[PDB]
Amino acid sequence: GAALTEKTDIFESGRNGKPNKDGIKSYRIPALLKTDKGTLIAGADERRLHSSDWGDIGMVIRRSEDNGKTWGDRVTITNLRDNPKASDPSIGSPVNIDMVLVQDPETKRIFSIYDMFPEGKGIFGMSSQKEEAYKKIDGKTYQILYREGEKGAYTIRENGTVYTPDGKATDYRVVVDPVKPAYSDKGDLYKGNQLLGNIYFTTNKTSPFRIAKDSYLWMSYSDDDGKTWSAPQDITPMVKADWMKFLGVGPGTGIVLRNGPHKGRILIPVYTTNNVSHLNGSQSSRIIYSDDHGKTWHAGEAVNDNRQVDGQKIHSSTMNNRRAQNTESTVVQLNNGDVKLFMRGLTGDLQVATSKDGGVTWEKDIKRYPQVKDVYVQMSAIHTMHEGKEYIILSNAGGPKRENGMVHLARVEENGELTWLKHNPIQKGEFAYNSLQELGNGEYGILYEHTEKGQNAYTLSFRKFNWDFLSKDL
């Protein structure tokens, strides 16, 4: 009957502030994906120097070919090299953080989309003034490079050749086609055959060039079930509006629409901040999507765009309202075609937005479910069918704080409305970010953050449970 496996540790953090067996202090931000081959891919932030949202962080995954019983060795998707001359190593490396995994059911290509920041304190080190990151030239978009003492924008063109602001080729070049393991050479700046530095370094530089100190979105893909990954592709220019300050993913696992006029569309949860209130009052959820199997991406509109708050309208680009913010989110499509966005917020309970057009726009009323508490932490939710009936399973912390992990079960009515049926505990003690996946045969899996015995935040563990666990009271 009711079944819940013992927790299995997939990514182990060190303890008492010390590095683990591999010299890594922390792991965070789980992403779990069940591929067409039945493989389970567990992704995470490999945070070597500390648990904060910056520093030396690699995008890594582990593959399980036996439904979660055993896992292979870590596979690094991307890990940029540190600035060896930074005065403070804790904030001395270009950063990659927070990933979203998803597989196209037709092409079978698996995508890993994550944030990228040049050297610094990441999202918590966002400059006050905007720096243009790209420049269009002859219908071609090129990434910009800045040089101290010059106002003009240099550009990185074909073969990584650096061009002067006046459009003339220089003897400088950027490694735009990295070849080292983990693509740690991406961004390396050369003058002839001499390695001078890296365009992602922002302090104590040894080369003359650096990219804009902004927020970026990178994408890597695998066509061999997660074993090998392509070099990172910068998709920022396709989805980041000029007013956006921060633009990052709502970590976890994205989806591909199963039905409706937009069937096949890949949806990736993301959120932004604006230059008016930034992290204090503008965090706003939305999704980015692709209708051509991940070749090109587009941004949907924010849930907060033209939203009525306390009698007046707001826009994600101009708002300054702490309570109206919605940040990291998880997305699900119902059988009626509607898209539901469950968003991390500050109301104390579950906030859900609904889109009738494949995730581009959102209906006016954001539904709140007092039945499901929200202590302001990431969550994950998935669509599922049982005995011909439609449901949604959602997991997050039960509180008081980021503790007591819960798995909430809701019945999906014909009109898309939700009816919460059960709320069952899955992990006592510390519990934070998590990622759910249906495994089939009435089983489900979850990769989540938890600590105990002095473990550093966090150790990512895995558990499997079935329908009896979800619907029955233990």
Task: Explain the layout of strands and helices.
Layout: E1 8-11, E2 26-34, E3 40-47, E4 57-64, E5 75-78, E6 95-103, E7 110-117, E8 134-137, E9 140-147, E10 154-156, E11 161-163, E12 169-174, E13 188-191, E14 194-198, E15 209-210, E16 216-222, E17 233-234, H1 236-239, E18 247-249, E19 252-253, E20 255-256, E21 266-272, H2 278-281, E22 284-290, E23 298-299, E24 307-309, E25 312-314, E26 329-333, E27 339-343, E28 349-355, E29 367-373, E30 380-386, E31 389-397, E32 403-412, E33 418-430, E34 434-440, E35 443-450, E36 459-466, H3 467-471
Parallel strand pairs: 6-19
Antiparallel strand pairs: 1-36, 2-3, 3-4, 4-5, 6-7, 7-16, 8-9, 9-10, 9-15, 10-11, 11-12, 12-13, 13-14, 16-17, 18-21, 20-21, 21-22, 22-23, 24-25, 26-27, 27-28, 28-29, 30-31, 31-32, 32-33, 34-35, 35-36
Active site: 53, 328
Family: Belongs to the glycosyl hydrolase 33 family.
Binding site for substrate: 28, 344
Can you offer a commentary on this structure?
This protein folds into two domains: 1-132 and 213-474, Neuraminidase; 133-212, Intramolecular Trans-sialidase, Domain 3 (Intramolecular trans-sialidase, domain 3). It has 474 residues and is mainly beta. It contains three helices and 36 strands. It is globular and about 70 Å long. 50% of the residues are buried. Helices cover 3% and strands 44% of the residues.
